[model samples]
Target: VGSLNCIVAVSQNMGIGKNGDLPWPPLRNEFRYFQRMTTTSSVEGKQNLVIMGKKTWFSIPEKNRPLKGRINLVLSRELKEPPQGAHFLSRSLDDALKLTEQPELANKVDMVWIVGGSSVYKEAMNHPGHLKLFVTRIMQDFESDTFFPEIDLEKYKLLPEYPGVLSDVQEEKGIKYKFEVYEKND
Candidate 1:
């Protein structure tokens, strides 16, 4: 199976969303950082699989559907067909992971990225695979109803630095944040 990782942004209070949308003002650089991490693949002719919950999939604007170079896989049991531009519809995360194991897709997939909502993030964190977490910690807080699940530090340790990731605190539009990576210790 390909390596599984999650990419998320959270506030000091662990808030991630408000009314299905980001609670904070747009941080252009951070958005660009997300684009780079999820779209870049080291292997030639290979692509990353971005697994997201149905709401997350729809949350993106129609013009950005398919998410450019990477494959978009949406998890949903309610949908009868893959939404407008989604490449695949998975009934569960297990089903989505299975797509990575198929002979045809296995070699072409370099990474599996869990892009989320609460339930999806929780499921990905519990997956028994080598998991890495890419977190963008916003320096401030905002009113939000959605939040990131509590991370178990005993199982995943925060790394001082990760290759291909910016290590220092970054400030954009006066909003301070930093890129953080955590790897499963075991």
Candidate 2:
């Protein structure tokens, strides 16, 4: 069986993005967590796969086009080729997942991390399989139109704690936040 993991930061209202960009100011401290958690491969000889939507891809600053130390797959149907700096182009989430199983890639990746737009997250959450949600819960509310889908508590069990995950609330830029992990039960 295969599984997917998602990484995102949301406000009290579960707002993730606005105008195709982050609604709040940059939180490089939070980015450090995202960078570490996603960059570290689960095992040797393999790397984690980062699947992001087209807008999500551009959402990243041009300076950090392809996130380092990871295989970047841009999910886009309009683009005929992988966007500059991206390792691959996927038409759909299913297609991206399928690529991980190809004999050529089967031995190359350990985990797939979804960093996305609303539609992409909605689809991944609905996808029947194991999934891990790495969420940073922001205590303050921000103005945003894009929101993360509500979790079905029955299906996703929030872990009490996880290694290297800071359970205690952290404050930066005068905003308080906490890290949480949710594992799909079924």
Candidate 3:
């Protein structure tokens, strides 16, 4: 059985934050939480693959481009060149999954992670299959330019979290946030 996962941050003003060390409101703990969950060692030489929209790709920093230790995939409506180390596809979310399911790619991937800019999350949410999400609630409120799509609470269930382990890193921006995992209610 295949699975789909989404990782994002939300703001009180409904703005989606960007990557990096900017001390804005709705403090997004960078990409640390998402990376920790998605990164795993490959004993059989398989790795996780990350699928992102074209806009999301552009959001990533040039130095941090082509997320290390994972297969980077970009989905764009218009056929175009994939940035640097990513594989470009002129396919919809469903089409991208079909392509990933090919033996060559499927055998090497553990799961597909949908990292986004709003619209990508919207498409993933409309699919009939179940979805898992890792959401971080930052303490500070900042002006955000983007936001995560509205999720149907009835469709997802919150998994247990470590007790009293709500905080992690203490950065200049704000305290590191807790990681919350949610899976489809099944």
Candidate 4:
């Protein structure tokens, strides 16, 4: 099979809640959905790498800090060291591609998954390569100042959609969502 890169994210008027709060309601339930779609279970052990900007890395809870199983790579222009459990790489999207395609990285990782904060997602999509997108559409209009970039839907083909029940606790926050997978047609 050909190598692939996957990106998983949620878009909101605000990238995340104020003070860097997570937008997904009911933290516990949202994490379950996040882990389910992001972990090895989704790729069936094809070897994966996760790339995130410093902000996204910081957003991860200290206890859940270094994402396990997959290689965690943090892309930062200012940060010199990755937080505990992650590897640090100072590179733009172009540099990331070089690292991923190098014989060493190519042999080590089969899939490069971009886990983001808006900027990183936009950068990843701009790479001259096909990407697999895993998106979640929330029903509620969040009062957020951070927003995900608008993507050209015409560039992709929806591969699959799995609708999930809103966690009972989430209704109180007025949040409901569905998961969708998209692949680049080009």
Candidate 5:
């Protein structure tokens, strides 16, 4: 089995997006943080696999699709073939997990990352595995049409400090945020 982790940024209201995009202004540092979290690999020659919904896949600009280096798995029942940069097309979250668990691919995949859209996040949150949440809590609220699913604090507990993650509040462009990690309690 592969490790599963989720990385997302949310506002005080758990708002994640607005009109197929981020509601808040672009924070370069946060973007870099996301890149580092998702791209870093522990085992040499292995890469992390990112799973996202069709809407989330399209929300990213074409030029940035596939997210470079890491493997991209897009969930879509309507699509017959994988998109331009996508490496795999899965019909469901289970299917995506099965694909990564295959012996041929499992050896090459270091971790599975759930990159969002509400439906996808909801599925990942319910998965029966060791799930780690890398959350960037934006201090301010923004008008958003899309929101993150409620995290069950009972099942997952916040970590005081996670390796390679900044434990203190961070600010950029006058906006305050913090990097938090929640690990599933065994």
Candidate 6:
């Protein structure tokens, strides 16, 4: 199975959304980085797996469906088949995370990226595996109803910096944010 990781943007209070959408206005820098990080891979002709829940799936514009370069894995109890343009459907994060291990998908998949809704992020963070956390820390707060679950510092340690990830705080639309990563303590 591919190594698992998560990528999410959060507010100062660790909030992620409001009314099923981002609480803050679009941050183009963050937007570009998200696509770049998930799509770039080491091996040629291979792609990463981007696992997300149905809410996050449909929240994206239809024209931008299937996300662009990676395999799209959507988790939903009610979706019998993957959504239009999606590659696979699973009942839960546990099931979806295991999809990369299937014989046919192994050669095609490299890293597994968990993008999400609150519940899905919580579940993916706890699943037993080599999971890393990628966070876009919005240095300001927004009015959000949903939040990222606690990231246990005991289990994962914050990496000082990572390759291809910007180390300095980035400002977009007058709001400040930065790229951060947390990997399991071994």
Worst 10 residues of 5 by lDDT: 100-109
lDDT of 3 by residue, 57-166 (tens): 77777787788887788888775667776854646788778876687676777777888767888887666677787766554566665776766777877777644224
Model 5 misses residue 92 by how many Å? Answer: 0.7
RMSD of 1: 1.2
Better of 4 and 5 by lDDT: 5
Candidate 4, residue 46: Cα displacement in angstroms equals 5.9
Please tell me which model should have the higher TM-score, number 3 or number 6: 6
- Candidate 1 Cα deviation (angstroms), residue 69: 0.4
lDDT of 1 by residue, 1-186 (tens): 646889999999999989878989889989998999999988998998899989898788789998999999999989987898998889999998998888768688887889998899999998885899999999998889989998999888999998889888999888899999988833
Considering only N, C-alpha and C atoms within 3 Å, which residue pairs clash in candidate 5?
none
How large is the C-alpha RMSD of every model relative to the true structure? 1.2, 1.4, 3.6, 3.9, 1.3, 1.4
What are the Cα lDDT values of the candidates? 0.89, 0.89, 0.67, 0.63, 0.89, 0.87
Question: What TM-score does structure 2 among the candidates reach?
Answer: 0.94
The C-alpha local distance difference test score for the whole of candidate 5 amounts to 0.89
TM-score of each: 0.95, 0.94, 0.80, 0.77, 0.95, 0.94
Tens digit of lDDT per residue, candidate 5, span 23-136? 999999999999998988889999988999998999998999879979999999999988888999999999888887687686788878898988888888888868898999
Poorly placed runs, candidate 5 (over 4 Å): none
Tens digits of per-residue lDDT for model 6, 91-144: 987787567678878788877888998888888787776878999999998999
Candidate 4 Cα RMSD after full superposition onto the native fold (Å): 3.9
Off by over 4 Å in 1: none
Candidate closer to the true structure by TM-score (higher is better), 2 or 5: 5
Segments in model 6 whose C-alpha atoms lie over 4 Å from true places:
none
Q: Candidate 4 has which clashing residue pairs, if any?
A: 13-146, 14-146, 15-146, 15-147
Question: lDDT of model 4 at residue 75?
Answer: 83
Clashing pairs in 6: none
